[PDB]
Amino acid sequence: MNLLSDKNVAIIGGGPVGLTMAKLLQQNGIDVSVYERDNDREARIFGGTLDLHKGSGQEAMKKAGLLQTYYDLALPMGVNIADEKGNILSTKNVKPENRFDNPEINRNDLRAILLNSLENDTVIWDRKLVMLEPGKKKWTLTFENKPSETADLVIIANGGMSKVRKFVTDTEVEETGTFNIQADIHHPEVNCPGFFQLCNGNRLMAAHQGNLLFANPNNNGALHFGISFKTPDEWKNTQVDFQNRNSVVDFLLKEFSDWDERYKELIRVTSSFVGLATRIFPLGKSWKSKRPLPITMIGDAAHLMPPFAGQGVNSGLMDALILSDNLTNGKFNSIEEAIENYEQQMFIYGKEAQEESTQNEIEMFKPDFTFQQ
Template sequence: MKQIKDKKIAIIGAGPGGLTLARLLQMNGFEVNVYERDVDENARPKGATLDLHDESGLAALREAGLMDAFKANYRPGADRTRIIDQHGEIIFEDNDNQNREDFRPEIDRGPLQKILLDSLKPETVIWNSHFEGLKRNGDSWLIEFKNGKLLAADIVIAADGANSKIRPYITPIKPFYAGVTIVEGAVYASATSSPEMHKLLNGGKIFALGGEKSLIVSSKGDGSLVFYTGCNTTENWVKESGINFSDKLQVINWFKNEFSDWDPIWLELFENASTGFVPRPQYCMPLDQNWSSLPNLTMLGDVAHLMPPYAGEGVNMAMLDALELSNCFKDPRYNNSGEAIFAYEKQMLKRASETADITMQSTAALHSTDAINFMMNIMGME
């Protein structure tokens, strides 16, 4: 019988979860390639900073032997947090997070991606590989790509994000709308283009809360900042609003109206935004989701357990998935990939359900009338 180590593994998606899994598998002698639709590693802009948690994201990096590289690239002080009300008044600030037991160091997405890419064997990642479809090929798979390439793999792992095209091959279960829509923007060179907000941000992170709305702002190591509003809306609000989100004036007018009881200081973000705005309705996988495991196809990260960002668990969950799946693949207790995948999915689904429950509670609380008290309680100040 062909052992797991002798099988060709294809990971679809070069996000943090997929790259972490590739690194962990290569370290243990597995044959693996990552297929990514982007033409190269710089094809798309990198979003907000990531705070890695000791028991998940950092645990995966430790196992991958990449903590020295992480320490050379993370951003001390970027986890400084200010809770601010809608009128611009600072309610709370936490400037000494490194001494907290739950210290969660921040790293920009770009440097984290580079650390993981540099840790892989040359040609591990096959760029410009846009997944098109899967076909069974005996006990393995044929993977079709939009560029016409056809590739055989013994095991396929979906790491292709929230809008995964592979998930339906595993389960018909779909995410439900979480009740909140985000509008995301970015400001480049914020020190000069948005000086008041740059000063208020102080190199860290802002949680602005009030009127059942949120505005979260994060600094980045390249001198830019990213921000996103959160509002309770209907699922189809983006279309129903009639707003062209690439038209700055339309978005500014929406913000002035929707956040009319907020201090004008917040308007500076929208007036100086450097790119088009991106609306993002938030979804979550059902907390009780389950499916029958397949012997040679599984998934990790947002593909498996999409949830809103209001508990900071997304990238950490994906990297922990990678750690747990790699551990199952190398565990001698499992005789084949089917047994390993079953064991991985059983623990992953239980963990994801618990985390999604916490995340949905946080999402609702941060967009309620008691949001500031909720946030203060999280920071241990209530």
């Protein structure tokens, strides 16, 4: 019959994009396994919420039959812009006509939606892919301290830091020159009451002198905030130890010195911080043209970009929707031609998304930016 009849697909990485790719193939009768580094699905995913947009992220969920399950676990949320003094400068609340536009979902809820939709044993846990080798017809996959597997098609979906890209591209991940510190506060109504009342059930964003603060007061009962700034030149080839909360507190309280005490309370009561340099996997010249066997990349492994334009997962789920339709629609003469068609479209929307990310990033970290239009 079709391109993948009597063939199996290996997806590397069980993030939202890989699991979506698995669902869209599996529901067309395709033999697909997902190899995920993580030991069990009972592991907290650290991060904020994700919003699926109409026409991209939501299309993927709709084609999968999971769009209602997403709406049931997602939460529409307004945005408040505030100054460093705790003045609300602007309050965009959720008009009921727009409540389906991009409601926020917890990363563990999205993962659980996608896992429950797959056949038992679709995802193989504790499988860290370390290397690929193409045979005559099949790839051999090598995992850390676990037996090898084979596949006719490999889809790299294992995130922005993937080390298994080289059969697709020699493109290297780059630092953009911004740095992000993320943290969670449990029971924020009790533990950061001032900042919680400032948020007032809305997301909050504030900018003063090249420091940006973002918060969501309701990621499944926890408040999630991030502080972003131009990487201090001091930290060329980090003078802050992120395992030492006292060191991060001391750095942040100096940087936030002229901010209202409701923001400094955030910094003071945070049990642990996570620091990460902003990185991009730049889409430039095309990828390797003549690969030994069929292989491609979707999600952050394809187009990792700064998280400043609300884009990221949406272009990933668009990757999964286009590749899965190309592999299953009957229109292509080979797996290679289905892949080429996916990559050619992804290079267009992906270059646009990356350009918008990089532009927002340049603008937002002028030493004199405020969210004010």
